Amino acid sequence: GSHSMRYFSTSVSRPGRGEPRFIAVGYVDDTQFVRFDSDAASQRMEPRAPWIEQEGPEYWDEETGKVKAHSQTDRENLRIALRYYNQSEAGSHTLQMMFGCDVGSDGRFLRGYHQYAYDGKDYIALKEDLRSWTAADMAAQITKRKWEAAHVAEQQRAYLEGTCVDGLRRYLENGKETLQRTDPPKTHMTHHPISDHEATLRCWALGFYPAEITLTWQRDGEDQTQDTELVETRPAGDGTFQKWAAVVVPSGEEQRYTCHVQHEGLPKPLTLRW
C-alpha cells in the first residue's frame, strides 16, 4: 500500500481572554509523531512517537521555527477574515489548516494537499493539479486572486513534491517496524437480548492498524445497510483501532445474518455467523 503524511493545525479565537490558541499535530498514516501547543510552556515542537526522538537539535530548532511562524500567520488570518465578513470581534472563530502528501509503494509522489477551513467549512484549497485554487465564497476569492498574483501555488507545490516527500520517506525508513506494519482485526460476535422478540447482534473488530476498515451486515446475502448501527472507528490507545457494527434481529432469525470484514491486513475478507 501507499503512505501519507499530514499536519492538522487549529486556531481558535477567544475574545476577552487574550490571543488565539494554536494547536498543530503531525501524522504519518494513523500514527501521530509531533505536536505544538501555543499555550504550553515549552514553546517547542515536541515528539509524540518513539521513532522521531532520534532527531537531532537541528531538527527540533528548524521545525519549532516553522510552526511558530505558521501560528503567527494564522493569527493574522483570523483578523483578516473578520474584516472580509464584517463579523463582530466579540465572536469566537476557528481557522483550520491541513497540508501534506501521499506516496506510493515506491516512494513516488501520488498527491499533495494544502487547504484551509473557516468556522468548520471549506475556505480555500489547492486543487489536485497543484496549479490553481478552489475558493468557496466571495471572501475566499479575494485570497485566491492575491495568491495567484504572488505564485503561492508554485511555492507550495515545491514543498509538497520535495521536502514533504523527503520527510515522509525518512520517517518511513526510521520507523519501519511501527509504520510499515499491518495488524489484522481480531473479530468476534456478541448477542444482546432486547425483549422476548428482539436481540442485538454486534460484530466486533479489535486491535487493527491502519484505521481504515469496512464492516457490513447481510441477511440471506443482501445488504442490510440502513438497519445497521455502525460506530466511528476509535483508538484503543496502544496504537491500534477498534470498531463494531450491529443489527437488531427477530428471535430465532440470528442464523440468517452474516457479518463481513474487509481490511488490508487480511489476506481475504472474513465472514462471521452466529
Binding site: 516553522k66 511562524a69 505558521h70 500567520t73 492575491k146 514533504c164
Partner: peptide, 9 residues
C-alpha cells in the same frame, strides 16, 4: 517536516 511559508488571506 513542516512547510516553510504561510502567507496572508
Amino acid at each position: 517536516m513542516y512547510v516553510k511559508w504561510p502567507w496572508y488571506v
